[PDB]
CSV table of C-alpha atoms and ligand atoms in Angstrom, one decimal:
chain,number,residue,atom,x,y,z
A,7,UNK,CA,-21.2,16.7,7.2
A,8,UNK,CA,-21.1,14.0,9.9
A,9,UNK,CA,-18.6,11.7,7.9
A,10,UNK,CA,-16.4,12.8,5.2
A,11,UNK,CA,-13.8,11.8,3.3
A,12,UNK,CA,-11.5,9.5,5.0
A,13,UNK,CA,-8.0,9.8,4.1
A,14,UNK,CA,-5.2,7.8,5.2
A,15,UNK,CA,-1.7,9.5,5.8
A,16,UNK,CA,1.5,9.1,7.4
A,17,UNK,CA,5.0,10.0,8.6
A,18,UNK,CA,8.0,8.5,7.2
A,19,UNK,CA,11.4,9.9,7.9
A,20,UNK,CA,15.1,9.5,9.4
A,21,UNK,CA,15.1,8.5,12.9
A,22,UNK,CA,14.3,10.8,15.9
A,23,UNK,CA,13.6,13.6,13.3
A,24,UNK,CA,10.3,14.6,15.1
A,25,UNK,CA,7.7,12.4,13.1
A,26,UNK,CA,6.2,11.3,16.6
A,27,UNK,CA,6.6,14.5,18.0
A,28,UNK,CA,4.4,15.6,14.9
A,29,UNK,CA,1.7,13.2,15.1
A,30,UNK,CA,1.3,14.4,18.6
A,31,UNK,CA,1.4,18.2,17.6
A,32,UNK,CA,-1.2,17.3,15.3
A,33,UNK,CA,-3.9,15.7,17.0
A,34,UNK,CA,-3.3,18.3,19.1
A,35,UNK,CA,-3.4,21.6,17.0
A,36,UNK,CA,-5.9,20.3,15.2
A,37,UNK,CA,-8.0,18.8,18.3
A,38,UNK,CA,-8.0,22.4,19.3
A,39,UNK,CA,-8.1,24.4,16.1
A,40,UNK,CA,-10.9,22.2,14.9
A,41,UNK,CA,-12.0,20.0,17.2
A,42,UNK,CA,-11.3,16.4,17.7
A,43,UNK,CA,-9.5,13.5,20.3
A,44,UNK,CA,-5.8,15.4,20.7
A,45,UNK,CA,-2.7,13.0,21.9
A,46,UNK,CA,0.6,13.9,23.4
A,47,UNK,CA,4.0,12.4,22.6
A,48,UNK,CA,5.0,10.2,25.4
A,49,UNK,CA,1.9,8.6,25.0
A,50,UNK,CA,2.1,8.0,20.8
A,51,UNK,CA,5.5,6.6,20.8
A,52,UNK,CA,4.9,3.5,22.2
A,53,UNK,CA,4.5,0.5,19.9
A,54,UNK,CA,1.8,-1.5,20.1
A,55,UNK,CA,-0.6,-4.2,17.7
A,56,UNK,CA,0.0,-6.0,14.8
A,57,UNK,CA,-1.1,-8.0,12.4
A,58,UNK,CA,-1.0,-8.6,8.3
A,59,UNK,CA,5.1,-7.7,14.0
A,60,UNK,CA,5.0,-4.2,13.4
A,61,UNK,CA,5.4,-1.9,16.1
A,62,UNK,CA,2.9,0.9,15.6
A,63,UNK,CA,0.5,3.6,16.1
A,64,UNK,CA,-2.4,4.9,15.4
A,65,UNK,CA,-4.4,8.9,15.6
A,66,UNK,CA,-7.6,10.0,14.5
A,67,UNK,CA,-7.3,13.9,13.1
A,68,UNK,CA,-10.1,15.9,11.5
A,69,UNK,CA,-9.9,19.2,9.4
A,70,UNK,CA,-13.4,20.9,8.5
A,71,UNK,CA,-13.4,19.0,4.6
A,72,UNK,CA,-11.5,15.5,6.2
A,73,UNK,CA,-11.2,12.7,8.7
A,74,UNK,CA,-7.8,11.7,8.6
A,75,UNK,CA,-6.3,7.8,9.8
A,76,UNK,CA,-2.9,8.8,10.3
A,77,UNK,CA,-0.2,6.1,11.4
A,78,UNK,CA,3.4,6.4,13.2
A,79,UNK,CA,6.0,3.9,13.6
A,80,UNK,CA,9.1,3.7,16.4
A,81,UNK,CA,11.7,2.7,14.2
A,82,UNK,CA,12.6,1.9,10.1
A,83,UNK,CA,12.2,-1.6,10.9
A,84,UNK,CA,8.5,-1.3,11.3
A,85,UNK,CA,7.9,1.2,8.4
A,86,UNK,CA,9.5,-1.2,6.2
A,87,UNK,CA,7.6,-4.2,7.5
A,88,UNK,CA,4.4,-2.1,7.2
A,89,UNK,CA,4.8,-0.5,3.9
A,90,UNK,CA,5.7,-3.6,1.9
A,91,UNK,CA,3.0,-5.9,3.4
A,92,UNK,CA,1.0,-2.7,3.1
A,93,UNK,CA,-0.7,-3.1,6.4
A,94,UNK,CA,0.2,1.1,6.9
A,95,UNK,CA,-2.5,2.8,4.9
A,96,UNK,CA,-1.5,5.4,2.9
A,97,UNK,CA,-2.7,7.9,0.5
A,98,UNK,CA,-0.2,10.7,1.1
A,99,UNK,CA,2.9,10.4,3.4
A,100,UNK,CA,4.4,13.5,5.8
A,101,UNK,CA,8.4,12.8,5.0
A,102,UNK,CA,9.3,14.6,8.5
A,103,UNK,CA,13.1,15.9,8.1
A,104,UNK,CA,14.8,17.9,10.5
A,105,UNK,CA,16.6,21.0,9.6
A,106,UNK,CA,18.9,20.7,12.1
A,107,UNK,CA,20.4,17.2,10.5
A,108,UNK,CA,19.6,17.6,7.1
A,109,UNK,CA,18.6,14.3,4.8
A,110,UNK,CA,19.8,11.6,6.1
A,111,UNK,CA,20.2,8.0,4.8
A,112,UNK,CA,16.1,6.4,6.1
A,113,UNK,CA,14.9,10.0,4.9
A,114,UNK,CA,16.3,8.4,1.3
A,115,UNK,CA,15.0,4.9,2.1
A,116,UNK,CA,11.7,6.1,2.8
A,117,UNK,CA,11.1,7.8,-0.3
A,118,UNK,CA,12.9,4.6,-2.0
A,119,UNK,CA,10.4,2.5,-0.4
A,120,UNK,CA,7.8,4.8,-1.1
A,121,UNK,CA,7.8,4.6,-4.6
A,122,UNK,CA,8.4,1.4,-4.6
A,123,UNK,CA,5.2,-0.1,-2.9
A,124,UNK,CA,3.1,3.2,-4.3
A,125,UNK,CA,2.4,5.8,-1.4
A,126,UNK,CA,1.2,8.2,-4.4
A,127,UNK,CA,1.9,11.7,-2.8
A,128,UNK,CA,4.7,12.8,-0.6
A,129,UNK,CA,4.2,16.1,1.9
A,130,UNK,CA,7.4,17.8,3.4
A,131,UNK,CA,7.6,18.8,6.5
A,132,UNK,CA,11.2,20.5,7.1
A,133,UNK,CA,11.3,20.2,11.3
A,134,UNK,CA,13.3,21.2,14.3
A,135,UNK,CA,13.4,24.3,12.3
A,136,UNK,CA,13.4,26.7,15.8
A,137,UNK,CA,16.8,25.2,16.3
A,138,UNK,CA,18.1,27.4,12.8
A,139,UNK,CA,18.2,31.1,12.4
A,140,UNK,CA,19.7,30.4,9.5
A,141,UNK,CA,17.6,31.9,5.8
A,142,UNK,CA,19.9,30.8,3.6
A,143,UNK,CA,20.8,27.4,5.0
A,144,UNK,CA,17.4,25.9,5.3
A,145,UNK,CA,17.2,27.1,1.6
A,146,UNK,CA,19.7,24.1,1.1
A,147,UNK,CA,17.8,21.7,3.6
A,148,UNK,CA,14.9,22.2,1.1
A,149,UNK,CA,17.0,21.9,-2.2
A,150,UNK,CA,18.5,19.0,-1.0
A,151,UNK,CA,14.8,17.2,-0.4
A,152,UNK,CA,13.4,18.0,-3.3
A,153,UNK,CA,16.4,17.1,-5.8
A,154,UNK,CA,16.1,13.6,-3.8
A,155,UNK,CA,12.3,13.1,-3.9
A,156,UNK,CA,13.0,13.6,-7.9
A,157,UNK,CA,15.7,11.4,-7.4
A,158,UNK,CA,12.6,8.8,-7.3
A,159,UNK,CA,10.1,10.1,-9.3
A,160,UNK,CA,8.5,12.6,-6.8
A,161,UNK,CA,7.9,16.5,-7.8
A,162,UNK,CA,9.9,17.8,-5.7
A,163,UNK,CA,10.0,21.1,-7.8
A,164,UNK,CA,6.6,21.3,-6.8
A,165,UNK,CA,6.8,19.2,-3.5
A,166,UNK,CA,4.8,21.5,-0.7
A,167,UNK,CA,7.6,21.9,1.8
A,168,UNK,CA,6.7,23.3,5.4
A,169,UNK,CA,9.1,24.8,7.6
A,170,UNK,CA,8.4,24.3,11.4
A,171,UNK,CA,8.5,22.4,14.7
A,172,UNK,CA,6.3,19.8,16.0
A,173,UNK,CA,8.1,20.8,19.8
A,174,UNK,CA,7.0,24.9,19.8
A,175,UNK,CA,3.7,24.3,18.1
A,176,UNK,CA,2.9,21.0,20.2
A,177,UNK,CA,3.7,23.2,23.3
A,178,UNK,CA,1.1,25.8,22.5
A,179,UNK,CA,3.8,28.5,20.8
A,180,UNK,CA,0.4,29.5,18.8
A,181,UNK,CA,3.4,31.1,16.1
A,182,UNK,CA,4.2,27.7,15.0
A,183,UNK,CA,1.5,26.0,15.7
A,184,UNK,CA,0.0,28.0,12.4
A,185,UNK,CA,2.5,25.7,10.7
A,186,UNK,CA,0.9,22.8,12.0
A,187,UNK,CA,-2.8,24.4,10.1
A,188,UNK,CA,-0.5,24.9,7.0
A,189,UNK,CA,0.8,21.6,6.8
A,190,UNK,CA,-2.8,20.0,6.9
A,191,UNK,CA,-4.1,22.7,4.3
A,192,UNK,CA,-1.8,20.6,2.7
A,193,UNK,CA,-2.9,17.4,3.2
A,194,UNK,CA,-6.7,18.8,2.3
A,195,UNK,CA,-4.7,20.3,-1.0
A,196,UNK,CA,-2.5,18.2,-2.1
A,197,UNK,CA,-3.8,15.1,-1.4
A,198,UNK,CA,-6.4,13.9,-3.6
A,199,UNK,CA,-9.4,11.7,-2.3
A,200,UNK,CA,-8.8,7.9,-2.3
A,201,UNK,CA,-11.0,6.6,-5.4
A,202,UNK,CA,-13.5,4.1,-3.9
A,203,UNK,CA,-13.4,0.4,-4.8
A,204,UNK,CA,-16.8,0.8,-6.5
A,205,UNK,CA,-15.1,3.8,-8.9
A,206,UNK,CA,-12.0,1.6,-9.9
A,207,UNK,CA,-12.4,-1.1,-12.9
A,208,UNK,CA,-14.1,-4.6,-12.3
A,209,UNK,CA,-11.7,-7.3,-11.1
A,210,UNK,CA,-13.3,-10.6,-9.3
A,211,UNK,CA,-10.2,-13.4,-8.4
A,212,UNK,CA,-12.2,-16.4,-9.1
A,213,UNK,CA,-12.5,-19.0,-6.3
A,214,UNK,CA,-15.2,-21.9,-7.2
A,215,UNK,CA,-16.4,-22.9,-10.8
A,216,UNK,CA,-18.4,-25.3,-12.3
A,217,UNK,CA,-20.4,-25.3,-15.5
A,218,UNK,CA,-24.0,-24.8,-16.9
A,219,UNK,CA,-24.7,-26.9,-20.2
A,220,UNK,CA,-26.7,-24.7,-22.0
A,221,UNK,CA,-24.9,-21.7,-21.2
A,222,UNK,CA,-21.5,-22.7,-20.1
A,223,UNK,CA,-19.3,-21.6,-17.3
A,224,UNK,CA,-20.1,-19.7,-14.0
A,225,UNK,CA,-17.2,-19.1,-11.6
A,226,UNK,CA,-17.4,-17.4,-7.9
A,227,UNK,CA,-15.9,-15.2,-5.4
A,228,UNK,CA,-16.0,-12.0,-3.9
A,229,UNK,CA,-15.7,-8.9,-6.7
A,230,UNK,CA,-12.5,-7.1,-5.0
A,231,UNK,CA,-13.5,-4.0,-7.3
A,232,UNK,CA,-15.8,-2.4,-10.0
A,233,UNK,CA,-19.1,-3.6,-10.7
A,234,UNK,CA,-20.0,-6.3,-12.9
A,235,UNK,CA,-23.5,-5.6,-14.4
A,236,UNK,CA,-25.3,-8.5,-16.3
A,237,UNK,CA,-24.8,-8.4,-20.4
A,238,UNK,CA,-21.0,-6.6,-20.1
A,239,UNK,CA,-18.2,-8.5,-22.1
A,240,UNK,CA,-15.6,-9.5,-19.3
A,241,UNK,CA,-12.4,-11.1,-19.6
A,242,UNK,CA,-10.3,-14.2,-17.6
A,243,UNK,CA,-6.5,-13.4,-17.3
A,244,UNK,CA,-4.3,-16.0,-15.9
A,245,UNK,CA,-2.4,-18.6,-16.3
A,246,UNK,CA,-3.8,-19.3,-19.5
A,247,UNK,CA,-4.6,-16.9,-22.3
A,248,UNK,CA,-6.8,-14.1,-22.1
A,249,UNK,CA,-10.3,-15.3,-23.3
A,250,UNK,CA,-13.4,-12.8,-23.9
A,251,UNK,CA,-16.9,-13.4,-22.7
A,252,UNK,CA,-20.1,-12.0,-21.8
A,253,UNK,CA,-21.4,-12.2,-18.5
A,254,UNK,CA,-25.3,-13.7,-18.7
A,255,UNK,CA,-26.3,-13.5,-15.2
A,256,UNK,CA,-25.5,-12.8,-11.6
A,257,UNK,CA,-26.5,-14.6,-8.6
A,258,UNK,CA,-26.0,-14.8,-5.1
A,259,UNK,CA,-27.3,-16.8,-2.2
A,260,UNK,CA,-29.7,-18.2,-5.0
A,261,UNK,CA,-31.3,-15.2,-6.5
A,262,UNK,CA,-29.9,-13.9,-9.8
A,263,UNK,CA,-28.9,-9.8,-10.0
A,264,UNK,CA,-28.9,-7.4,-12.2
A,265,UNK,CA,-25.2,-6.5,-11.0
A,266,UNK,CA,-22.4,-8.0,-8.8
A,267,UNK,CA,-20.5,-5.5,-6.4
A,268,UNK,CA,-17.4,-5.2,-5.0
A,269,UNK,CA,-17.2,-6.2,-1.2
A,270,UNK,CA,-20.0,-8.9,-2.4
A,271,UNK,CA,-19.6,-13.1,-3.5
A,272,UNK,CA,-21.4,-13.6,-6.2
A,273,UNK,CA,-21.6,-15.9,-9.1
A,274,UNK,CA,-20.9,-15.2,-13.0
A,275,UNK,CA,-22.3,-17.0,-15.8
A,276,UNK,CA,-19.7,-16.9,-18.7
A,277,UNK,CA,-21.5,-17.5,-22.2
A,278,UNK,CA,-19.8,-20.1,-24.1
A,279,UNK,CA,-17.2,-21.0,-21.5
A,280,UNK,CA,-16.2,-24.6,-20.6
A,281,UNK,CA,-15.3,-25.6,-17.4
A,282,UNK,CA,-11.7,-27.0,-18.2
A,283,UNK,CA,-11.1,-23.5,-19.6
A,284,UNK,CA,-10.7,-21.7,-16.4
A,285,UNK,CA,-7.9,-22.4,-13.8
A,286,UNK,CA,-7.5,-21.1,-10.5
A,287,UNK,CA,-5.3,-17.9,-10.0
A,288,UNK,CA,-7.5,-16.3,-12.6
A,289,UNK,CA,-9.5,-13.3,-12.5
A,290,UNK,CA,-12.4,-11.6,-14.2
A,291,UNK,CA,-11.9,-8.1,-15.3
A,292,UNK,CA,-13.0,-5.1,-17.7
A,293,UNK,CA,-12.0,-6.4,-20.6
A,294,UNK,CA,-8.1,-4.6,-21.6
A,295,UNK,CA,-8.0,-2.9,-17.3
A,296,UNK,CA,-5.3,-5.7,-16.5
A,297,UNK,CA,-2.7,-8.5,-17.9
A,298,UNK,CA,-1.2,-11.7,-17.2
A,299,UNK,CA,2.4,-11.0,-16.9
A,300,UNK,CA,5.2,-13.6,-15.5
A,301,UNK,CA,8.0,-11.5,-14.4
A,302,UNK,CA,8.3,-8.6,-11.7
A,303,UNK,CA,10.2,-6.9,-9.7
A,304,UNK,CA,9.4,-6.6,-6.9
A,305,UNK,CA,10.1,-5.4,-2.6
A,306,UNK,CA,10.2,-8.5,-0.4
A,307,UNK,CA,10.3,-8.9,3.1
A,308,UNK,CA,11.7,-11.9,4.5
A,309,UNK,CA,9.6,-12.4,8.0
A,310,UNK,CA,12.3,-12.6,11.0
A,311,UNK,CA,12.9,-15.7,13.0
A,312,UNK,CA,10.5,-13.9,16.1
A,313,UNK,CA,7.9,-13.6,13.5
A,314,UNK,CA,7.5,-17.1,12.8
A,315,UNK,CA,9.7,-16.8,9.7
A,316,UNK,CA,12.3,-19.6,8.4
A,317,UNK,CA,15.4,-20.0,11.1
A,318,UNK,CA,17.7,-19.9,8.3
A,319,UNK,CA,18.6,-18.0,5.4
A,320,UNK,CA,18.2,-18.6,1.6
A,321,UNK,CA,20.5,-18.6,-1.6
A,322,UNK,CA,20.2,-18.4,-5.0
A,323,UNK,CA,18.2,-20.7,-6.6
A,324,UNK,CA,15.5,-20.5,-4.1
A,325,UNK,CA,12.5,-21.3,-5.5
A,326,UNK,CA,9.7,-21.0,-3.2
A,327,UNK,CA,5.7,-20.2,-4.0
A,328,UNK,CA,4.2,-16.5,-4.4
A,329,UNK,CA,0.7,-16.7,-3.6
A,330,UNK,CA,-1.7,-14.7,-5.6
A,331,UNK,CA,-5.0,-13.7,-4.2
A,332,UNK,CA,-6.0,-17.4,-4.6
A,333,UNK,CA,-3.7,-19.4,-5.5
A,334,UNK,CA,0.3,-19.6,-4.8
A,335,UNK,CA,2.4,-20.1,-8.2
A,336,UNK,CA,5.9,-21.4,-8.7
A,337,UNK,CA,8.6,-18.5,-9.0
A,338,UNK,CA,12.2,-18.3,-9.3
A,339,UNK,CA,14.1,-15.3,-8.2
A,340,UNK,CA,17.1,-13.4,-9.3
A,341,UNK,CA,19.1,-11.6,-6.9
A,342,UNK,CA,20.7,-8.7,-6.4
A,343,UNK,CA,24.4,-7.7,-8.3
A,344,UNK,CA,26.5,-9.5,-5.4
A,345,UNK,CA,23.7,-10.3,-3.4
A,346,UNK,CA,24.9,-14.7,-2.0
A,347,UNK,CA,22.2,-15.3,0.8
A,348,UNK,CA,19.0,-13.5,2.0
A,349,UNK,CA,19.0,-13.0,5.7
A,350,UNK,CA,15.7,-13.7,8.1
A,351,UNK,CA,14.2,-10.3,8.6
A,352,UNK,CA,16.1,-8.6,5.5
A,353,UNK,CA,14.0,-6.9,3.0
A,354,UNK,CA,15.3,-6.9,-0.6
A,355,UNK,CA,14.5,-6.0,-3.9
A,356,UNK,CA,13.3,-9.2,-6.2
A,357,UNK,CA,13.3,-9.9,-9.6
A,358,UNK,CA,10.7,-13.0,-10.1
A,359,UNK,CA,9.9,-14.8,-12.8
A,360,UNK,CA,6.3,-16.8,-12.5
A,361,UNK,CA,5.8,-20.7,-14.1
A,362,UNK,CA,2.4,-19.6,-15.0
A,363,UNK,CA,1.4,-15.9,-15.5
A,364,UNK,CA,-0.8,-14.0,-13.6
A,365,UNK,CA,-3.2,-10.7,-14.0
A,366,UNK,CA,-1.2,-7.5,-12.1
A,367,UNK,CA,-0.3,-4.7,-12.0
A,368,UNK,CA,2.2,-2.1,-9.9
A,369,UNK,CA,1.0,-2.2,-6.5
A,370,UNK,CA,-0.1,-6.1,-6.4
A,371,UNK,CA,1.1,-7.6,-2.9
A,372,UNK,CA,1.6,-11.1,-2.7
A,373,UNK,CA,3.1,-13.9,0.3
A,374,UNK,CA,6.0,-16.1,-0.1
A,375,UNK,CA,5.2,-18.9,0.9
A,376,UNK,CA,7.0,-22.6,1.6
A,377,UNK,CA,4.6,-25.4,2.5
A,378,UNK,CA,1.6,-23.4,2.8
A,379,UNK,CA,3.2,-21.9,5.3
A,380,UNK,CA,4.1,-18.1,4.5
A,381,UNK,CA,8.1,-17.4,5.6
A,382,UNK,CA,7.5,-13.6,3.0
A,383,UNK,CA,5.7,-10.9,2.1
A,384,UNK,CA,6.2,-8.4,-0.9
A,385,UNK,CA,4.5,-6.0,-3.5
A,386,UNK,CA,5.1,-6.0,-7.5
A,387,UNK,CA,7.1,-2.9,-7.8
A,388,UNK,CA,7.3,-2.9,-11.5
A,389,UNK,CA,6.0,-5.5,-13.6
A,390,UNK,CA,9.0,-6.5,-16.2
A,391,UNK,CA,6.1,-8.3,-18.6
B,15,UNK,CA,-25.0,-21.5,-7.6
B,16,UNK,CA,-24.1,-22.6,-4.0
B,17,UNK,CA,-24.0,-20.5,-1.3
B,18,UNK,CA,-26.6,-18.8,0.9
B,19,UNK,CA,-25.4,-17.1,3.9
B,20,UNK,CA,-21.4,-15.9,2.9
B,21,UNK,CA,-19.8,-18.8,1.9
B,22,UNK,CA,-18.3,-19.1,-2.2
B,23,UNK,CA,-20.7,-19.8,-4.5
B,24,UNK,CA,-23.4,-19.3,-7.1
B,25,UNK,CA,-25.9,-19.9,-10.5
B,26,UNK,CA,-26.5,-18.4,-13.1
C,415,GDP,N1,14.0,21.6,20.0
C,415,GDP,C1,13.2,20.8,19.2
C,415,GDP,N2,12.9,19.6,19.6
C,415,GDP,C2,12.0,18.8,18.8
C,415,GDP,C3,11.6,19.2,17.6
C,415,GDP,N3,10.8,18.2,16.9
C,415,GDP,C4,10.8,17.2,17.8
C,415,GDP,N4,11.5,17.4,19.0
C,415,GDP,C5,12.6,16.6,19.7
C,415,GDP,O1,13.3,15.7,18.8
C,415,GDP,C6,13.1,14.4,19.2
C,415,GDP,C7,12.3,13.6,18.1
C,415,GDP,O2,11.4,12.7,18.7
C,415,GDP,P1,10.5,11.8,17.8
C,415,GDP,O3,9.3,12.6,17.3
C,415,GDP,O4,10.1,10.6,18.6
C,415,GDP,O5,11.3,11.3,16.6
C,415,GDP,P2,11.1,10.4,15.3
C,415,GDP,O6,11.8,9.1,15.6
C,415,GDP,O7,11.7,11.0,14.0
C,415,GDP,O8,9.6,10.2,15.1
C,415,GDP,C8,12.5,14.4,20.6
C,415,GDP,O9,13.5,14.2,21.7
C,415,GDP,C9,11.8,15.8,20.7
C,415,GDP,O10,11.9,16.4,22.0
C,415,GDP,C10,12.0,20.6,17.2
C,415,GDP,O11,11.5,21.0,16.1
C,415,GDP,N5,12.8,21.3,18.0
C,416,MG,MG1,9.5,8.5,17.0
């Protein structure tokens, strides 16, 4: 051991449904149970940080197979915020519903939301269910979940769903607490390990280029994925049409590689390309892993007036920049069916349409952008083509 | 390539 897979996870959920009081029970059972830095409530509600204004937190829980980054937010506002720019990690998410209320409408935009910006899993944890005596009833309170996770493309006929109480296991009621253990034999279970950057297929957004005579073109920037090993055929999405190549050397501070990896600049050297045949918003890639596409839909969040966004909303028509790992291209945007103005802070979906194509996929997150300066954030949620 | 420390760049 020492350090093992690291999984990121979360709770989503209807207001004051217990997901704080859960991430403290956690920490906690666990802490004990296994070992590790245990929190309380009062003290993992508050909201912090930022970066990528989102009011958060943040715990630290291990199991004897996992170290687990686990993050919990005060209100929907933040989960939204943090979700779409994707500054909230996460592999798997603990939907936290209480028994008592039942699903409620942010237990429905949660798993919305989820889908949209590609949490992958979804773990159910039914709570507040001390406060029911009821056998039939929270029979219901789990029927209803999973038809609605399936309501968004979530198994929720085979959803893990865990009845208990992050108050009488937080406490130290030991017979609950057990739910706390089942709930991360879960999270060991049906999560799956993250697949390293190294693992996933070769993508490099190109920043500088210039050309070689003999050879052709070599471009540079940092390999965001995959490895690219010198003689492999390669490809440059974007913009323009795909072109093939092979890629005839590596180099990088000067001295030429066998390989480029990802989390490392480097330059390629792209046989038989000319320099006028690469513009920037392109990428390198395993040739047939990605495409240029021009129109998406996508889940946008307009930054609010206190986060330095625009002072005043925007209407149809708007056509404002989406910046793509390097470059920002020209978009318009369709609206939603009776949908006039877009309000500062709203977050809505978008159908955009690119003047220029770029290489994506679902997942992608992107800034909206006016001036350089970035008013929006958002994720492709489904690429149209 | 160009670079040499951490900044864009390359050969080839
Ligand atoms: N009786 C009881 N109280 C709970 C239970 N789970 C959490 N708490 C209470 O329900 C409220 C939920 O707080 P919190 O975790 O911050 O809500 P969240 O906004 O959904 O994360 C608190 O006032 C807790 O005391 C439970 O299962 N039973
Ligand atoms: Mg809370």
């Amino acid at each position: 051991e020492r350090t093992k897979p690291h999984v990121n996870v979360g709770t989503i959920g209807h207001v004051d449904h217990g997901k704080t009081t859960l991430t403290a029970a956690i920490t906690t059972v666990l802490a004990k149970t296994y070992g590790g830095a245990a929190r309380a409530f009062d003290q993992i509600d508050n909201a912090p940080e930022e970066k990528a204004t989102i009011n958060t937190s943040h715990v630290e829980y291990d199991t004897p197979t996992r170290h687990y980054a686990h993050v919990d937010c005060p209100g929907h506002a933040d989960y939204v915020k943090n979700m779409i720019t994707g500054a909230a990690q996460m592999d798997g998410a603990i939907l936290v519903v209480a028994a008592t209320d039942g699903p409620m409408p942010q237990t429905r935009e949660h798993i919305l939301l989820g889908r949209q910006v590609g949490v992958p899993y979804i773990i159910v944890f039914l709570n507040k269910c001390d406060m029911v005596d009821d056998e039939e009833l929270l029979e219901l309170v789990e029927m209803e979940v999973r038809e609605l996770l399936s309501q968004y493309d979530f198994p929720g006929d085979d959803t893990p769903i865990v009845r208990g109480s992050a108050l009488k296991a937080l406490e130290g009621d030991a017979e609950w607490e057990a739910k706390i253990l089942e709930l991360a034999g879960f999270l060991d279970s049906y999560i799956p390990e993250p697949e390293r950057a190294i693992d996933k297929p070769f993508l490099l957004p190109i920043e500088d280029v210039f050309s070689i005579s003999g050879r052709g073109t070599v471009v540079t920037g940092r390999v965001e994925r995959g490895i690219i090993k010198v003689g492999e055929e390669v490809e440059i999405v974007g913009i323009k049409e795909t072109q093939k190549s092979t890629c005839t050397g590596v180099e990088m501070f000067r001295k030429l590689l066998d390989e480029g990896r990802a989390g490392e600049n480097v330059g390629v050297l792209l046989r038989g390309i000319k320099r006028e045949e690469i513009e920037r918003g392109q990428v390198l890639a395993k040739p047939g892993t990605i495409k240029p596409h021009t129109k998406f839909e996508s889940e946008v969040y307009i930054l609010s007036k206190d986060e330095g966004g625009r002072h005043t909303p925007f209407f149809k028509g708007y056509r404002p920049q989406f910046y793509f790992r390097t470059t920002d291209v020209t978009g318009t945007i369709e609206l939603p069916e009776g949908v006039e103005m877009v309000m500062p802070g709203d977050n809505i979906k978008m159908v955009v349409t690119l003047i220029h194509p770029i290489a994506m996929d679902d997942g992608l997150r992107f800034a909206i952008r006016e001036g350089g300066r970035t008013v929006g954030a958002g994720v492709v949620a489904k690429v149209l083509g | 390539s160009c670079n040499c420390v951490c900044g864009f760049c390359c050969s080839x």
